[PDB]
Each structure stands twice: as C-alpha cells, then as structure tokens.
Design a binder for this molecule. Structure first.
Ligand SMILES: [Mg+2]
Ligand SMILES: [Mg+2]
Ligand SMILES: [Mg+2]
Ligand SMILES: [Mg+2]
Ligand SMILES: [Mg+2]
Ligand SMILES: [Mg+2]
Ligand SMILES: [Mg+2]
Ligand SMILES: [Mg+2]
Ligand SMILES: [Mg+2]
Ligand SMILES: [Mg+2]
Ligand SMILES: [Mg+2]
Ligand SMILES: [Mg+2]
Ligand SMILES: [Mg+2]
Ligand SMILES: [Mg+2]
Ligand SMILES: [Mg+2]
Ligand SMILES: [Mg+2]
Ligand SMILES: [Mg+2]
Ligand SMILES: [Mg+2]
Ligand SMILES: [Mg+2]
Ligand SMILES: [Mg+2]
Ligand SMILES: [Mg+2]
Ligand SMILES: [Mg+2]
Ligand SMILES: [Mg+2]
Ligand SMILES: [Mg+2]
Ligand SMILES: [Mg+2]
Ligand SMILES: [Mg+2]
Ligand SMILES: [Mg+2]
Ligand SMILES: [Mg+2]
Ligand SMILES: [Mg+2]
Ligand SMILES: [Mg+2]
Ligand SMILES: [Mg+2]
Ligand SMILES: [Mg+2]
Ligand SMILES: [Mg+2]
Ligand SMILES: [Mg+2]
Ligand SMILES: [Mg+2]
Ligand SMILES: [Mg+2]
Ligand SMILES: [Mg+2]
Ligand SMILES: [Mg+2]
Ligand SMILES: [Mg+2]
Ligand SMILES: [Mg+2]
Ligand SMILES: [Mg+2]
Ligand SMILES: [Mg+2]
Ligand SMILES: [Mg+2]
Ligand SMILES: [Mg+2]
Ligand SMILES: [Mg+2]
Ligand SMILES: [Mg+2]
Ligand SMILES: [Mg+2]
Ligand SMILES: [Mg+2]
Ligand SMILES: [Mg+2]
Ligand SMILES: [Mg+2]
Ligand SMILES: [Mg+2]
Ligand SMILES: [Mg+2]
Ligand SMILES: [Mg+2]
Ligand SMILES: [Mg+2]
Ligand SMILES: [Mg+2]
Ligand SMILES: [Mg+2]
Ligand SMILES: [Mg+2]
Ligand SMILES: [Mg+2]
Ligand SMILES: [Mg+2]
Ligand SMILES: [Mg+2]
Ligand SMILES: [Mg+2]
Ligand SMILES: [Mg+2]
Ligand SMILES: [Mg+2]
Ligand SMILES: [Mg+2]
Ligand SMILES: [Mg+2]
Ligand SMILES: [Mg+2]
Ligand SMILES: [Mg+2]
Lengths: 57, 129, 117, 115
RNA sequence: CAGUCCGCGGAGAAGCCAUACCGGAAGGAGUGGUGGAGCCGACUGAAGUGCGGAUGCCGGCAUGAGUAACGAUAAAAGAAG
RNA sequence: CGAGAGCUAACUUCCGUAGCCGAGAGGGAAACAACCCAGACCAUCAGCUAAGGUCCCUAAAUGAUCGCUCAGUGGUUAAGGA
RNA sequence: UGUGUUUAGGAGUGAAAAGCUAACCGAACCUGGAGAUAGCUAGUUCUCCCCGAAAUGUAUUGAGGUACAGCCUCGGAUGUU
RNA sequence: CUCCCAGUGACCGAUAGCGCAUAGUACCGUGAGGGAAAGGUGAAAAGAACCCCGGGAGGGGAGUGAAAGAGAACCUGAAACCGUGGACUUACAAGCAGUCAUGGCACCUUAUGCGUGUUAUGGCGUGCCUAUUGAAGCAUGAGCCGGCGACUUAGACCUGACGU
RNA sequence: GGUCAAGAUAGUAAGGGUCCACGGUGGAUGCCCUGGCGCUGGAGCCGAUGAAGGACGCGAUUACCUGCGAAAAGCCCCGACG
C-alpha cells in the first residue's frame, strides 16, 4: 500500500498543470434602468430592477 | 540634470510612487488572490471596479479596497484624471506566514501554513496610446 | 582565534552559478546541481575541442568529392591525382574554397586527371 | 443513471426531503415571497403549485388534503380561503423565480420565489 | 586574529549586487549600483582556517497542491433584528 | 595458452603464465572494464597512418581481374541423408 | 468499585504470558561513570607539479582484521653493478 | 579550590561565546530531571500635526530629519522560494539537461569584438559521491539554499628531516 | 494584375523555457555591544541575638524585576557630594 510521488515536481511542469486555473471574468452588463452593472438573468444589485423594481433595496 | 552625489540626490529629489497602493499582511493565500488580480490587470479602472465586484471570491474584498486607494492617491495626491485611470499594474507577493501545530492520527503533529498577502496595484492614465 | 567560513563559501558558489547561466532548471540556480552539470560539461568541452577537427575534416572531404563527382572523378581518384603531381600540397579546406570557385576547381580536376594517365 | 427519473435529493433522506418541501411551502404561503437558494427554489415551485391546485377544489376534502402537508392551521385557512380562490382564473403557473445572485459565506447563488 | 610598515575613508569603509578584464590554478583587480562606518595592500606570527554528501545539525523556503479533509447520517427551514 | 576439481558444463572454483581492467582517456567491435587498434602536457577550421573500413544511413573505389554460391546461404549447431 | 494506604529493580507483584511495574520491560526511569568499547558503517572540504602501487608469501582463537617480508615514494651514498 | 571581586587577552561577538546579551523562564515530565530561541530607528524622538482610500489593518501625500533610498514587522538585507514586466523563443517532439559548430533575432557602460543575451538545426555525449573485481545504474546517501560540521592538544617523552 | 494547378514558406500562445530589469520573502553577511570565556591576582565561611533558599505582602495607578519589610521602593545617628 501507500503510494507516494517519486521525484519532486518541477516548476515548469507544475505551471503547465495550473494552465487551466485561469478565472473566467463574469459577463457583466449595465442595467438599462440605472447606472451600474448587473449579471445577466439576475436583478440589478444597485437598483433592484428586473423590470419594475424587484428586490427591496 | 543630475547632482553631485547620492547624498545630495537624497536631499533634493524625494522620489514619489505615483498610482501606487499596497495592502500588506492580508491574512489570505496569495495563490488564491492572484486568481482575481489577474482578471483586473491591464483593464479600465471602472471595469476593475465592476469585475472585482462580481467575481465570487473572498479574496475579492481586499483586492477591492486597495484598488480604491490606488485610484484615491491617483486623484487626491497625483492630479490624475479619473476618466483616464486604468490598472497599469497589479500583483500580489507573499507576506509572512503564521505557522500552527495541527494534531493528526496516532500522535503525530504537523505544521500548517497560514500565508499572508501583500496585494499591490498601480493605476495610471490611459494616456498611454 | 575563531575563523568562520563566512564570505568565502558564497564567493565560490556565485562563481559556479555564474559559469552556469545558459542552463535549464536548477542546473542554473542551485549550486549543487550547477557544479554537477559543469562536471559533465568539462568532459564534453575537452572532448569536442579536438573532435571538432574530426568533424570539420569530414566536412572538407565531403565537400571535395562533390565537385569531384560533379566533373566525373571522385575524392579518392581526385586527391590521388592531386598527389600524383608532387606540387599540390594545399590543405583540404583550400580545396573546399576552390570547390566554391568552380573554374579553378575544374582546372585542378584536369590537372589531377592528367596525372593518373 | 437517471435516463428518465425525476426530482432531486437535496443531500438528505426521504423524510427530510419531505419536511423541507412541506415547510418552505408553509413559509411562502405564510408570506407570499421568500428568498432561498436557487436549487431549492426550483424544487419548491412544482410542489407548492400542486398544493395550491389541491386547495382550488373548495371542499373539506381539498382542505384536508392540504392539511396533511401544512400543519399550522392559520396558513391552511390562508391558502384555502384567501389564496387559491384568488388564483381562480389562473390556469396554472402560480409562482415565479428571479435570482438575486450570489451569497458570500458559501458562494451560493440565491433567488426569490413569489406568486 | 596579532605585531610592524604603507596608507584609505560621511566628496563615503566593510558587506551586498552585476560585469565581456587579469594570472597556470586556488584566486585577484577595473568600473558601476546599494550601503552608511570602519577598512584594504606588503612582511612576519598563530589558527576553532577552505564542504555536496555523514537517512549529518540549526534554520528558512519548496514538491505532493489548491490535493485529502473540516472530527459520528440527531436533518433543518422562513421571517425579523 | 598449460594443468587440476566439474559433465573436456558454467560470466563456476583453484594454481602457472602472458597481456588488458583495476588505476586507462581516444578509434574499431550497432551497443560493450576485459577483445583488436593505440598510453590523452597545452592550443590549431593543418598532414601521414594503425586496427577497422569505402552502396545510403555514415568518413572513404556502385574499385579492378579470375572464379564460387541463386540459398537471403551471408545473417544460429550436429549425427545423418541428398 | 471509591478512598486511604503498603510492596520496586535482579527487585516487586503474578489463578503463570516472562505478564505488569506511568503509552517499547527476557530486567523500568533519571542523573552520572561517560567522549564506555566499537577489528564494524558512513563521512573527512583550497589549487596546481612530480613519481606511482598492492589484492602475493608465511604467521596468527587467523580468514572482511593485524605483524614481517614483497611492491610505492623522499633523501643520502655508491656508481654501472 | 574559586560561589565572589579587580585586572588582563595574536578569547568569542548573536548557529560564536555560559543553557541565558539573561531564563534554569517558556515548554516536556507524576517524579528525579530535561530545557529553548534571543539583539540593532535615529545624532537626538524631533517618534510622523494635518489631509486622502479603508471598520480596520495597510497604504499615499504633507511635514520632522542629513537620510522616511531611517517610520516603529524600523542597520545592512546574500540564497533557496514566490511574483510582475521586457528580449529571444516554443504546440510531428524521443530528450543526464550539456559540448562544439553553423545560422536567425536582439543589444553595445572591462563592449563593435578571436563580442554579450538568446535561439533553430547538425554532430557529439551513460547525474554525483560511496562502496567496488566491476556503477548511468533497477547498489548506498541526498527535497532545495544558507549557515554550524571532522587529523587536534598535551609531555623536561622516543625517533627522522630541515634550520639556528 | 483575375481564376484554376503544383510547390514552398510565416505568423498566433493556453501554458512553458533561457536571459534582463523591478520587487516579496527570508535573515546569511559586515559592523557594533547592552553579554560571555580563560588566566593571573585578590578575598573567603553564614546560622538559635533565626542562616542558605523561599511564601505572602509594601507602592496614588503595579501584571513582572528590584529593594523593603506591617514602623514596610523603607525609619534613625555620623561622614562624603552640593
Ligand atoms: Mg493501502
Ligand atoms: Mg529638504
Ligand atoms: Mg518573519
Ligand atoms: Mg563530446
Ligand atoms: Mg455535500
Ligand atoms: Mg389537478
Ligand atoms: Mg563611495
Ligand atoms: Mg571578483
Ligand atoms: Mg553614522
Ligand atoms: Mg574587522
Ligand atoms: Mg574545523
Ligand atoms: Mg565527498
Ligand atoms: Mg547538506
Ligand atoms: Mg530541515
Ligand atoms: Mg480528486
Ligand atoms: Mg473532498
Ligand atoms: Mg474522517
Ligand atoms: Mg436560522
Ligand atoms: Mg416576513
Ligand atoms: Mg572431470
Ligand atoms: Mg570467475
Ligand atoms: Mg568467486
Ligand atoms: Mg580497487
Ligand atoms: Mg594499466
Ligand atoms: Mg580503451
Ligand atoms: Mg559487438
Ligand atoms: Mg560507437
Ligand atoms: Mg563499467
Ligand atoms: Mg573505464
Ligand atoms: Mg565483461
Ligand atoms: Mg586486428
Ligand atoms: Mg589518411
Ligand atoms: Mg589498412
Ligand atoms: Mg559518403
Ligand atoms: Mg555435416
Ligand atoms: Mg539501570
Ligand atoms: Mg533472582
Ligand atoms: Mg507499559
Ligand atoms: Mg571509562
Ligand atoms: Mg585478511
Ligand atoms: Mg611492513
Ligand atoms: Mg648486481
Ligand atoms: Mg548562543
Ligand atoms: Mg542568525
Ligand atoms: Mg540553560
Ligand atoms: Mg508557565
Ligand atoms: Mg504598518
Ligand atoms: Mg521605506
Ligand atoms: Mg533600508
Ligand atoms: Mg513602525
Ligand atoms: Mg548606524
Ligand atoms: Mg532592515
Ligand atoms: Mg514544428
Ligand atoms: Mg516528451
Ligand atoms: Mg560516465
Ligand atoms: Mg559484488
Ligand atoms: Mg541510486
Ligand atoms: Mg531514498
Ligand atoms: Mg613531572
Ligand atoms: Mg641537525
Ligand atoms: Mg487547390
Ligand atoms: Mg533583492
Ligand atoms: Mg568584554
Ligand atoms: Mg535570612
Ligand atoms: Mg494601596
Ligand atoms: Mg510593631
Ligand atoms: Mg551629588
């Protein structure tokens, strides 16, 4: 039993492994009924409008 | 257009760091923090204001506050125009590290690394180009 | 009197690391492996300095028989004909430079071939 | 595989799946809107719509069929005498979801469910 | 480290950092950059005096890796602060 | 090479003897401490050779002359047969 | 089963396994003798010049170790042995 | 003889030196007992009024100061190790990581050269040490950098070389 | 120059590598000393009128150290300094 890794892993191959951890920037889009930005198919956090005002704040 | 010696240059030129902010000792893994700090980098400081605000990481809080201070000292201290400002620079280096003992099975302990973070951002006018 | 290692060691180390600056991975940045890669580097250095003459001699000969056969002789017959006349004692490298100047090379080819007859 | 099955466990057993459905029913009927995780809201919508259509019969049977899932009497009277007669004209579709977005602690994307 | 010379130094010492220069090698110089208070060269004397190794020691930092887990399967949900 | 021991086995074991290796780099033997050539003071983009080679890989005669083998023998044994 | 208490290092205790004696008992732990001994292992760092071996013989509570020859080197003499 | 005092040193100078630049503390042990890391603003505190972003923490200005390239995580600040930016490069490649050669690009402060950085292709090429008859070995040791770390001292001793 | 054919040949970087430049880390290195070591030389016993070593306590505010002791960061007499 008890597998272990053999040789210490090198800087370069480590970085090739992490090559996929790039983050994906949200596709933001500005609220038509306000100033600020809002996630698509969500209510505008700043205003609260999904078409009238939807959330309280 | 230059002085006698470094002893004089130290007196007459005082060397400022325009656009610069740094947040030291942030109790967070840098490795995690760079993940967002890359997203921001090179972009319009308003898109940085918006990006940073929906990316869903704990690490987005400190990287938010610094960004403001960058823009703050870009505007209060440096006379820069905020419709030019943008993230010319952003990077996080590792601060010190809290080490703690953690018990594990059959009586062995291990050591555990609570890494801190020195986030840093440098906004500048999009007057380049 | 105590006399700690101190500045000595690190001078030596930086010298090695400075010899090893094209090198990949820790062959470039750790001392131990830097010094180790330089061990085989010394071997290969001292070999090639006198093997490089072998390679270049090959390249000279290899270029000479090309023009030799270009005219319808060949290296063995052509240098035997440039030897059969005593007066040709130029190095193969100069026969190469002549192989880059076709007219003089053909003059030597007709000279050589008029000596195995 | 589930090449046709339907539903969700919500990382819990059978009786827990059940009380959670019954009690978020009780709450969004008690209060007309609640905010909860997006999964669990998609879960709740068919349950509570089935239930309001149970209450649209008027009858003592319909109210007892609702009473089995909704054991706080005051909500049973609301849903029965207040809310299902209101939806009288509605051919089904007595609820909507909009998603308020992501929470901080666990990074869930919560949403609102109302009628 | 010591004795004796020769000297240098806030117009800036040692130390640190680059460097295509120099001796046959251990090495040593030139110039530049930090540094900010002591120090090089020659002759001699004494040594705790030259490290890659000892599953060596004290120390810091890597790899495994954003991986395993978060410590009983007695579940939790809505409002309001 | 010469013996013993062994099965006229062994990259077997024990002696004699010569050489190499140990302590030996360089060319050859695809590769290879022992075999064949040859003992590296340093430098050269100079020349003749050793062993070994000259169809392409791969440096160098698809060399010359009398044959031999049509089996891929060459490029894995023998008693015996044709 | 509580409390209090007695019995211990070749000693105690043991309805007997060499079991227990503060989580490694065919002789606990700590301090010390003490840097025990170690024919056994591993390790022993700056550079260049010159020369250059041995794994043989005999002896041995000897055979993986030692003594004396054998072979190496440094100096002196001799003087072609 | 040296708990203690003075003086002195071809003694140490923060892994050294007493274990301690102080502490037989912290911590480990039922106990007898074991037992650490150590340090440095600056001349003087003049130890940063006040403003800015932030609950902060942290930071940018302003001032003080010779220096804030000293700011209290306060002398220097080497290496591993983690990053940001720029040159050259890399997605039919077989590879002890190099060695020589040729070409392409970049650059010119011991430096326009018998150049420096990089690079493509060609040839060549069995890590290191140890222990060994024999080591690339699939034999031992070793994560990596630093720093501690091993042929010494003694004596009216014996013996040899050299010198006075 | 436009179409078709055959052929050759760039650039792109997810991520990587060597080099350069700027930092973070970390606390080696130089310098310093508020601390040690050794030799030499001095001095060498305390205690039943209470030792060595401690436990409480004393301060406007006192957790630790010092000093001190319910007369308690101390009381008296002498001398020195000013
Ligand atoms: Mg298993
Ligand atoms: Mg000024
Ligand atoms: Mg630290
Ligand atoms: Mg070679
Ligand atoms: Mg789960
Ligand atoms: Mg129905
Ligand atoms: Mg100077
Ligand atoms: Mg130098
Ligand atoms: Mg000063
Ligand atoms: Mg000094
Ligand atoms: Mg030593
Ligand atoms: Mg060694
Ligand atoms: Mg080591
Ligand atoms: Mg370690
Ligand atoms: Mg997994
Ligand atoms: Mg998991
Ligand atoms: Mg578990
Ligand atoms: Mg709750
Ligand atoms: Mg409510
Ligand atoms: Mg026989
Ligand atoms: Mg044999
Ligand atoms: Mg044998
Ligand atoms: Mg040997
Ligand atoms: Mg030999
Ligand atoms: Mg050979
Ligand atoms: Mg062969
Ligand atoms: Mg070969
Ligand atoms: Mg071999
Ligand atoms: Mg060999
Ligand atoms: Mg062999
Ligand atoms: Mg032969
Ligand atoms: Mg020849
Ligand atoms: Mg021949
Ligand atoms: Mg050829
Ligand atoms: Mg036959
Ligand atoms: Mg005992
Ligand atoms: Mg007995
Ligand atoms: Mg026990
Ligand atoms: Mg003894
Ligand atoms: Mg023997
Ligand atoms: Mg002898
Ligand atoms: Mg004789
Ligand atoms: Mg110490
Ligand atoms: Mg230190
Ligand atoms: Mg102590
Ligand atoms: Mg305590
Ligand atoms: Mg701070
Ligand atoms: Mg500063
Ligand atoms: Mg500084
Ligand atoms: Mg401070
Ligand atoms: Mg100072
Ligand atoms: Mg500092
Ligand atoms: Mg390609
Ligand atoms: Mg591959
Ligand atoms: Mg080799
Ligand atoms: Mg063997
Ligand atoms: Mg090995
Ligand atoms: Mg191992
Ligand atoms: Mg005597
Ligand atoms: Mg004499
Ligand atoms: Mg076509
Ligand atoms: Mg640095
Ligand atoms: Mg002193
Ligand atoms: Mg007393
Ligand atoms: Mg009081
Ligand atoms: Mg009284
Ligand atoms: Mg006075």
């Amino acid at each position: 039993k008890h597998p272990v890794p053999k040789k210490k892993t090198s800087k370069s191959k480590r970085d090739m492994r992490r090559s996929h951890h790039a983050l994906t920037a949200p596709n933001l889009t500005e609220c038509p009924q306000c100033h600020g930005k809002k996630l698509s198919h969500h209510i505008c956090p700043n205003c609260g409008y999904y078409d009238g005002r939807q959330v309280l704040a | 257009q230059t002085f006698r010696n470094k002893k004089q240059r130290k007196q007459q030129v005082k060397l400022r760091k325009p656009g610069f902010a740094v947040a030291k000792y942030v109790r967070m893994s840098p490795r995690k923090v760079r993940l967002v700090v890359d997203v921001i980098r090179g972009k319009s400081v308003q898109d940085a204001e918006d990006l940073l605000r929906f990316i869903p990481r704990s690490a987005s809080e400190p990287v938010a506050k610094v960004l403001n201070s960058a823009k703050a000292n870009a505007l209060h201290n440096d006379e820069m125009l905020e419709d030019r400002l943008f993230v010319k620079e952003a990077y996080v280096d590792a601060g010190p590290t809290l080490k703690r003992l953690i018990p594990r099975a059959r009586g062995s302990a291990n050591i555990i690394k609570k890494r801190t973070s020195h986030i840093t951002i440098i906004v500048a006018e999009k007057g380049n180009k | 009197p105590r006399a700690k290692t101190g500045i000595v060691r690190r001078r030596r180390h930086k010298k090695v690391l400075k010899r090893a600056k094209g090198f990949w991975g820790s062959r470039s940045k750790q001392y131990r492996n830097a010094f180790q890669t330089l061990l085989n580097a010394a071997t290969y250095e001292y070999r090639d300095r006198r093997n490089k003459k072998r390679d270049f001699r090959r390249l000279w000969i290899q270029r000479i028989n090309a023009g030799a056969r270009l005219h319808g002789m060949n290296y063995s017959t052509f240098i035997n004909g440039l030897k059969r006349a005593n007066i040709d004692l130029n190095r193969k490298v100069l026969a190469d430079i002549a192989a880059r100047e076709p007219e003089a090379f053909k003059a030597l080819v007709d000279a050589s071939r008029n000596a195995r007859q | 595989m589930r090449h046709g099955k339907a539903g969700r466990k919500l990382n819990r057993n059978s009786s827990a799946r059940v009380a959670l459905a019954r009690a978020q029913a009780t709450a969004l009927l008690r209060e007309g809107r609640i905010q909860t995780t997006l999964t669990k809201a998609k879960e709740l919508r068919p349950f509570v719509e089935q239930l309001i259509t149970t209450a649209k019969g008027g009858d003592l049977h319909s109210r007892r069929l609702v009473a089995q899932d909704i054991h706080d009497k005051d909500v049973v009277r609301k849903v029965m005498d207040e809310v299902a007669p209101k939806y009288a004209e509605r051919p089904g579709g007595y609820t909507r979801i909009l998603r308020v977005g992501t929470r901080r602690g666990d990074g869930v994307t919560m949403a609102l469910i109302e009628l």
